Amino acid sequence: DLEATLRAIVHSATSLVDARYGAMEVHDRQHRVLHFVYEGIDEETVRRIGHLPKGLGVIGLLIEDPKPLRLDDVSAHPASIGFPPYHPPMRTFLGVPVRVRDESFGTLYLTDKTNGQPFSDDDEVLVQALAAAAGIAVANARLY
């Protein structure tokens, strides 16, 4: 199961960096969402928010132009679309592409590092390393 694998990767990222929230989106070449896995938000809150992300705002930027991005305040970025009603507040941000050499498929991202600090150089390196493993997983599912 691909989503179980992607969830394991999100868990490792969130726990090791010590972020409150973690997520991964995988999309097709038209930018349609194929998979969205996440941790940090209870299902009651999920039910209030409603539909899962479509890959807009800051995530849209990263889908169009895959490369690592860290932000002190996600809502301050020019590409920021804003959260939907009932979504938890989130401030600090780290996002990296989920990719292989040939192609990028998705984005692994974290918000709200514990105790309020920005994501570090070391956090970005770690998250890139985990994402690469997810990149291989996604590339394999696309063949198999």
Task: Answer left, alpha or beta for residue 115, where phi above 0 means left and psi between -120 and 50 means alpha.
Answer: left
- Whether residue 58 contacts residue 92, with contact meaning beta carbons closer than 8 Å, is answered with no
Could you tell me how many residues of this chain bind ligand HEM (CB under 6 A)? 29
Our finding on whether 1 is near its own copies (CB under 8 A) is yes
Q: What are phi and psi of 7, to 5 degrees?
A: -60, -40
């938000």: which residue's tokens?
A: 41
* Nearest Cα to Cα of residue 19 among 3, 37, 4, 41: 41
| CB proximity list for 43: less than 8 A, separation 6 or greater | none
Helix axes 2-17, 121-143, angle to 10 degrees: 180
Q: Is 59 in the site for ligand HEM (CB under 6 A)?
A: yes
Residue 122 contacts its own copies per CB under 8 A:
yes
The one of its own copies, ligand HEM, none whose footprint includes residue 49, by CB under 5 to 8 A per kind, is: ligand HEM
> Binder to ligand HEM among 90, 133, 139, 141 (CB under 6 A)?
90
Q: With CB under 6 A as the contact rule, which of the stretches 34-42, 96-104, 122-130, 135-143 interacts with ligand HEM?
A: 34-42
Which chain residues interact with ligand HEM by CB under 6 A?
Answer: 21-23, 38, 40-41, 46, 49, 51-59, 74-75, 80-84, 87, 90, 93, 109, 111
Q: Summarize as ranges the residues that interact with its own copies (CB under 8 A).
A: 1-2, 4-5, 8-9, 11-12, 15-16, 100-101, 122, 125-126, 128-130, 132-137, 139-143
